[PDB]
Amino acid sequence: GDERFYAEHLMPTLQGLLDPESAHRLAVRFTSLGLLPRARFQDSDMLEVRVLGHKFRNPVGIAAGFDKHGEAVDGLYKMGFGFVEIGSVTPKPQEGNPRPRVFRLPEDQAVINRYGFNSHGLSVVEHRLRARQQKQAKLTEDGLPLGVNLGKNKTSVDAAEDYAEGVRVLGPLADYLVVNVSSPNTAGLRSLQGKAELRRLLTKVLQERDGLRRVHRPAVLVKIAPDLTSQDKEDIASVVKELGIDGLIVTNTTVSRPAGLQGALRSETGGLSGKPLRDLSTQTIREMYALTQGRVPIIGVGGVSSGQDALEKIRAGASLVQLYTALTFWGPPVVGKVKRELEALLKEQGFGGVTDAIGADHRR
Ligand SMILES: Cc1cc2nc3c(=O)[nH]c(=O)nc-3n(C[C@H](O)[C@H](O)[C@H](O)COP(=O)(O)O)c2cc1C
Ligand SMILES: O=C(Nc1c(F)cc(-c2cccc(OC(F)(F)F)c2)cc1F)c1ccsc1C(=O)O
Ligand SMILES: O=C(O)c1cc(=O)[nH]c(=O)[nH]1
């Protein structure tokens, strides 16, 4: 599994033969079948992180959206990810938007997607996870946690109830749950990021979570957008502190279109991911870390494709990071690359380990 071979030949050829969504479906199939290049990199103690009531062998996870229905969890761990997050999952099954709904921006090392929460639904995912529940229990104990990202149905009349249902159904199977109120492709979803609605929504979510039996009680995190106003961020930080939310995932895709995008499909509707989002995400992490006084665990996501990208987010305040778009361009080998580069940079910058670097920029 040569990083250069996948980056220079395999992936480019694959993308030249298959459209984005087809490539993705194949990716999921191959991953679930274990058809992956050998993960040479061996995790060192330096990369181990303890947060959210769990141990993570390494801080690099697969972001939500790649394995929406929980079909390739084990294959993703085999890829080298320190933790896996599936979803978003909606209460009832739904098809999402018509195709095409995902677009590549090669010149920008970016992607634009408007899937619209295509989901097999809670019931299907529930049984799929139950079939490997004990196997996961051992993985988690082994330092390989599982996260479940919750969404809401398009025609739902009670947003809060949709999330409450997800907590009750998939909460017992997850190490952590994500209340995703930052999808740019669901009408009025990001509005749930407002203070009044957010507090009511999260109060209900936490009540349902607290009602679960001890060993089946997951940490609850909120995934936010990179397009929030300063006021929005202040409010989120306030509610997080008020309710005791366990953590934040920063960030989801952006509806902004940074000047400089070259892709012919730059004006397609949807959320932009990849390099163009990287620093916007890092800065959002930096601000949320400060607003929460570094007391709230943050999973950094957005444009991570190298060890430097990962370390910048960690130094900005992230305890863990995730990636997705980088995988679509460079393939499976990118996971080992990021981990190897991160370890080298940590040493090079005098950090005994990842934990020591969390929020380092704020202390200089
Ligand atoms: C094709 C695609 C589908 C996604 N689906 C979801 C989703 O269902 N739920 C979610 O919370 N984020 C979703 N995301 C967002 C990613 O989890 C992540 O927040 C974002 O893409 C930034 O990371 P990246 O630049 O490494 O891709 C999706 C992203 C892409 C590119
Ligand atoms: O999943 C996308 N890409 C991917 C991807 F992440 C991973 C991928 C794999 C997975 C496992 C083994 C591989 O090596 C092999 F077996 F093939 F040799 C290649 C193939 C892919 F095509 C997306 C998503 C949204 S858009 C898009 C894309 O533009 O390709
Ligand atoms: O499913 C989608 O369209 C979607 C959801 C989400 O949270 N983020 C994203 O980029 N796309």
Q: For the residues of 309-364, what is the DSSP string, one character each? A: HHHHHHHHT-SEEEESHHHHHH-THHHHHHHHHHHHHHHHTT-SSHHHHTTGGGG-
Sheet holding 110-113, edge to edge: 102-105, 110-113, 271-274
Q: Distance (Å, rounded) from C-alpha 298 to C-alpha 286?
A: 10
The active-site residue out of 183, 273, 281, 305 is: 183
Ligand 1 in contact with 303 (CB < 6 A)?
A: yes
Q: CB under 8 Å to 40, separation ≥6 — which residues?
A: 1, 336
Residues facing residue 323 across a β-bridge: 62
Q: Distance (Å, rounded) from C-alpha 334 to C-alpha 312?
A: 17
Kindly report the backbone phi and psi dihedral angles of residue 189, in degrees, each rounded to the nearest multiple of 5, phi listed first. -70, -50
3-class secondary-structure state, position 237: helix
Ligand 2, atom 15, residue with closest C-alpha: 36
Q: Distance (Å, rounded) from C-alpha 362 to C-alpha 189?
A: 32
Kindly report the backbone phi and psi dihedral angles of residue 104, in degrees, each rounded to the nearest multiple of 5, phi listed first. -95, 140
Tokens of 175: 């190490």
Task: Check: CB of residue 273 under 8 Å from CB of residue 257.
Answer: no
Q: Element (H or E) spanning 248, and its range?
A: strand 247-250
Directed axis angle between helix 230-243 and helix 275-291, to 10°? 50
Ligand 1 in contact with 88 (CB < 6 A)?
A: yes
Ligand 1 in contact with 291 (CB < 6 A)?
A: no
Asked if omega into 282 is within 30° of 0 (cis), the reply is no
Directed axis angle between helix 333-348 and helix 307-316, to 10°? 60
Resolution in A: 2.0
Say what the alpha-carbon torsion angle 134, 135, 136, 140 is, to the nearest 10 degrees.
Answer: 100
Bridge pairing between strands 247-250 and 102-105: unpaired
* Closest ligand 1 atom number to CA of residue 182: 11
**Of 246, 270, 274, 242, which Cα lies nearest the Cα of 256?**
270
Q: CB under 8 Å to 196, separation ≥6 — which residues?
A: none
For the 1-364 domain, the top CATH level (class) is alpha beta
Q: CB under 8 Å to 139, separation ≥6 — which residues?
A: 77, 145, 146
Q: What angle do CA 231, 232, 234 make, to 5 degrees?
A: 65
Query: Ligand 3 — pocket residues by CB below 6 A?
Result: 65, 88, 113-117, 180, 183, 185, 252-253, 271
CA of 160 to the centre of ligand 2 (A): 34
DSSP line for 39-61: ------GGG-EEETTEEESSSEE
Q: Distance (Å, rounded) from C-alpha 328 to C-alpha 10?
A: 11
CA of 108 to the centre of ligand 2 (A): 18
Q: Distance (Å, rounded) from C-alpha 218 to C-alpha 203?
A: 15
**Of 153, 145, 345, which Cα lies nearest the Cα of 247?**
145
CA of 330 to the centre of ligand 2 (A): 9
Binding residues: 64-68, 88, 113-117, 149, 180-185, 223, 251-253, 274, 303, 324-325
Burial class (CB in 10 A: 0-12, 13-18, 19+), 364: exposed
Residue 183: active-site member? yes
Question: Which long-range contacts link 337-341 to residues 24+ away (Cβ below 8 Å)?
Answer: 337/3, 337/306, 337/307, 338/60, 338/304, 338/305, 338/306, 338/307, 338/309, 338/310, 339/41, 339/43, 339/47, 339/58, 339/60, 339/80, 339/307, 340/41, 340/307, 341/306, 341/307, 341/308, 341/310
* Closest ligand 3 atom number to CA of residue 68: 1
Q: Element (H or E) spanning 147, and its range?
A: strand 146-150
**In the 8-state DSSP scheme, what is residue 96?**
-
Task: Check: CB of residue 11 under 8 Å from CB of residue 331.
Answer: yes
**In the 8-state DSSP scheme, what is residue 111?**
E
Q: CB under 8 Å to 284, separation ≥6 — which residues?
A: 224, 226, 228, 233, 250, 251, 302
Ligand 1 in contact with 68 (CB < 6 A)?
A: yes
The Cα-based distances of 361 to 47, 261, 316, 357 in angstroms read 19, 29, 6, 8
Task: Check: CB of residue 208 under 8 Å from CB of residue 278.
Answer: no
Q: CB under 8 Å to 153, separation ≥6 — which residues?
A: 90, 91, 92, 94, 117, 162
Helical segments of the chain, H only: 3-5, 11-17, 20-32, 73-79, 122-130, 133-141, 159-170, 195-210, 230-243, 275-291, 307-316, 325-330, 333-348, 354-357
Nearest ligand atom owner, CA of 68: 1
Ligand 1 in contact with 147 (CB < 6 A)?
A: no
